[PDB]
Amino acid sequence: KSWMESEFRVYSSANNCTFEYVSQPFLMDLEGKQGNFKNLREFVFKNID
Amino acid sequence: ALTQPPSASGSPGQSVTISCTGTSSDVGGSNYVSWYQQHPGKAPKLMISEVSKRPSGVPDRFSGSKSGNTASLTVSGLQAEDEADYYCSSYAGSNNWVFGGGTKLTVLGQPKAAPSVTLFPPSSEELQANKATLVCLISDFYPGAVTVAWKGDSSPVKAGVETTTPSKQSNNKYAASSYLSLTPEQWKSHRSYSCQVTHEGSTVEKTVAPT
Amino acid sequence: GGNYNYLYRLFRKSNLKPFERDISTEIYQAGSTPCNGVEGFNCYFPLQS
């Protein structure tokens, strides 16, 4: 009785890393709902200096 | 290689052109095309840099241009002394660095001459010597852009022939020679051979038949 | 005899923005014809010691 995280297919290699951060562990839900959109998340990304 | 016609000449105080007509990906696909000059005995001297540029010296009669896969040089005014070879050159793709073929550039102040041709078949002692050589001599043909072709009874041949580069005589015209190697059984195989020489479009040929 | 552990970039297409870092070692093309990742005619390794 479970939805589980199986694949992570993003990159092949990662050679010369400069910055790295990893948050504290948690566990999301991953369960597929069937209602209406219940969550809005908004982000602003800027890149200066 | 690249292509340039091996003979071009004109009157002193005029404009002569020389075409380099390379392919793409060395001359058409680039811009680093140069022109050199070699007097008979010296090192080459850089005469024209990229496309149309000059070093110091180099009096402004020489000019260059490029119109696609054909770059060209033009001398505007033969003083007396710009007889040279004028190799064109290009940078090809992978550091290749190709070259040209070389064009003699004379200035016959007078009237062109006729290449006197003379042909000799293999002597008798050579026939007894189990070998055979045809001898084609060319002489007195002012402007030196001669070329030669050899003929068996009806067909051209391209094996066993050696051709001297033209050499200047005392009268300041040229002379040349070519040799044809044959086994005597091939000498009597074909009923006759000939040496033809072409010179400024014109052509003269001589012919000899075995006995 | 020299210490060659310290390097600097000598060639780039444009100036850096402030506070960025360029650790790429792609071969700088000084000419009009490309060179496909070999050093040679008008193509230089962009880092010197």
Ligand SMILES: *[C@@H]1O[C@H](CO)[C@@H](O)[C@H](O)[C@H]1NC(C)=O
């Ligand atoms: C990145 O990787 C390449 C090849 O593995 C290496 O030459 C280079 O030194 C690395 N970068 C740094 C900052 O060490």
Ligand SMILES: *[C@@H]1O[C@H](CO)[C@@H](O)[C@H](O)[C@H]1NC(C)=O
């Ligand atoms: C950012 O990357 C682009 C790649 O298209 C490059 O053209 C540009 O010069 C880079 N930024 C700077 C400041 O050079």
